[PDB]
Amino acid sequence: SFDEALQRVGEFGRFQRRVFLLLCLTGVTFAFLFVGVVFLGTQPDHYWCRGPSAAALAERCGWSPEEEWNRTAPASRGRCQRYLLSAPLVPCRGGWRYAQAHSTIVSEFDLVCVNAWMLDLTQAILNLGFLTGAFTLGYAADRYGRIVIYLLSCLGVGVTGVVVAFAPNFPVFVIFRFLQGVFGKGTWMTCYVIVTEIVGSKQRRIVGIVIQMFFTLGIIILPGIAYFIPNWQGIQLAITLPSFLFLLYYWVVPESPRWLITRKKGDKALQILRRIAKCNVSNPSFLDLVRTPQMRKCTLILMFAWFTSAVVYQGLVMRLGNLYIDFFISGVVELPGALLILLTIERLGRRLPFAASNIVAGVACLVTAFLPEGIAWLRTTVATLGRLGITMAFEIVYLVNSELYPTTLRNFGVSLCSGLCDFGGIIAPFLLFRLAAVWLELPLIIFGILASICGGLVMLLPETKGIALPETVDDVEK
Ligand SMILES: C[C@]12C[C@H](O)[C@H]3[C@@H](CCC4=CC(=O)CC[C@@]43C)[C@@H]1CC[C@@H]2C(=O)CO
C-alpha cells in the first residue's frame, strides 16, 4: 500500500529537511509579497499644488521645499487646494510636490485625497488577482504536474515583480500587480500542497505549523528589512528577487510521488522513491467536487469558514491601529498562538482548538462591542485576543482543509476555498463602512455572531485524524 512503500523510505530524512527549508523560504517570500502593499504606500509629510506664478516664484525658491510648503496654501496638509496668482484658494489637478525624501508609490503615481480610491483599489485588485489565481491555478496544477507549475508560477512572480518595479504609469502597474497576485497565489498554494504531500501522515502538523511560522517570520522581517533599502524600487526589487533564486533549483524538490502514482505513469514514481532512498481521470471537475452529498456538505462548511474567518480578521485589524515598532510587535505577537497549536495537536482532536478559537474570537468581538466610553486598555487587549484567536484559526484551517479533499483533486478544492477567502477580503471594507455608517460597533457584533456560527459548524467535520490521505472516491469514509 502507498503507506508501506513510504514506510520503507525514511519518514524524515536530511533531504526532506532540506526541501522543507527551501519551500519555507518560498513561503516567507510569499509573506513578503502580501505585506508589501502597506509599507509600499506611506503618506508623505506634506503635498500641495502648483501654479504658473507659483512655479515662477519657486524657480527662485526651489531649494528647501518646506519653505514652499510654509509659503504655499496650508489647505486650512494640502487638502488638495491651490492658490491663484484673501487670494483664490481653489483645488487643483496637477503640479504636486512632496517634501519627503523617502520615495513612495503614492508620490510617484500622484495618489491624492480625490485619488486615494485607487490607493485602496490596489489592494482590492491584488485580492481579486489572488482569487482568480486560486481559481485558475488549482485546475492547472491538477491537470499538469505540481512541481513544474510551482517553478512556472515562481518565474511569473519574478517577472511580474520586475515589471511592476519598472512600471512607467498606473494602469500597467495595476495589471501587472494583478498578474503578480495570481502567480503568487499559485506558487504559495502549490508549495503548501507539495510540503503536505511529501511527508508521511504523522509529522504533517509540524509541517503546516512551521510553514505558518515562516510566514510570521517573513512579516517579522518586513519591518526590519524596510528600514534599510528605503527607495521604493529597492524594496520592490528585494521582494521580487528571491523568486528567481527559487526558480534556480529544479534538481532538488522532485515531483510528489503520491500524486505521480495516479495511473498516469506509476513507473516514474518508483524511480523518484529510489532517488529519495539515499538515506536508507482526464481532469478534475466541479460536478465531481460537489456531487457527493457528505463531501458537498464538507466543502460548503469549509468555504463558509474561510469566508467568515477572513472577514472577521479584516474587521478586527481595521478596528486596530508608529510605522515600524507597531509592525514588529504585531509580527512577534503571532508566534505564541502558532506554538500553542503546534503543542496541542496529536493530544486532542483537530476541530476542537479551531472551535475554541472561533468561540474566543466571537466573545472578544462581543466584549469589544460594549463599554464604548470606558478605558482603552481592556478593549485593546480583548481585540488583540480575538485577533490572535482568528489567526490561530487560520493555521488549523489549512491542515484540515488539505485532509478532507481527495488526492485526485487536492489543489482544486483548496484553491476554491482560498478564492472565497480572497473574495471576502475584497468585500470586507465596503460592508464595514456601510454597517458603521448606521451605528458604531454593529459590524463587530455581526462578525461575532458569524464566528460563533462558524465555530458551531466546524464540529460537523470528521476529525481528520490518523486516516492518512484519501484516494479518489475513498474521501467519503465518514
Ligand atoms: C494569518 C497569517 C497571515 C495572513 O492572514 C494569511 C494567513 C494564511 C491565509 C492567507 C492567505 C491570503 O491569501 C491572505 C493572507 C492570509 C489570510 C496566515 C496564517 C498565519 C499568518 C500569521 O500568523 C500572520 O499574521
Curated annotation (Swiss-Prot):
It is found in: Cell membrane; Apical cell membrane; Basolateral cell membrane; Mitochondrion membrane. It catalyses: (R)-noradrenaline(out) = (R)-noradrenaline(in); (R)-adrenaline(out) = (R)-adrenaline(in); serotonin(out) = serotonin(in); dopamine(out) = dopamine(in). The keyword Mitochondrion applies. Glycans are attached at N70. Keywords: Cell membrane, Glycoprotein, Ion transport, Membrane, Mitochondrion, Nucleus, Transmembrane, Transmembrane helix, Transport. Pfam families: MFS_1 (PF07690). Mediates the uptake of clinically used drugs including neurotoxin 1-methyl-4-phenylpyridinium (MPP(+)) and platinum-based drug oxaliplatin. Plays a role in the anticancer activity of oxaliplatin and may contribute to antitumor specificity. It comes from Homo sapiens (Human). GO terms for biological process: cellular detoxification; dopamine transport; dopamine uptake; epinephrine transport; epinephrine uptake; histamine metabolic process; histamine transport; histamine uptake. Changing Y324F: Decreased TEA uptake. This is Solute carrier family 22 member 3. The gene is SLC22A3. Belongs to the major facilitator (TC 2.A.1) superfamily. Organic cation transporter (TC 2.A.1.19) family.
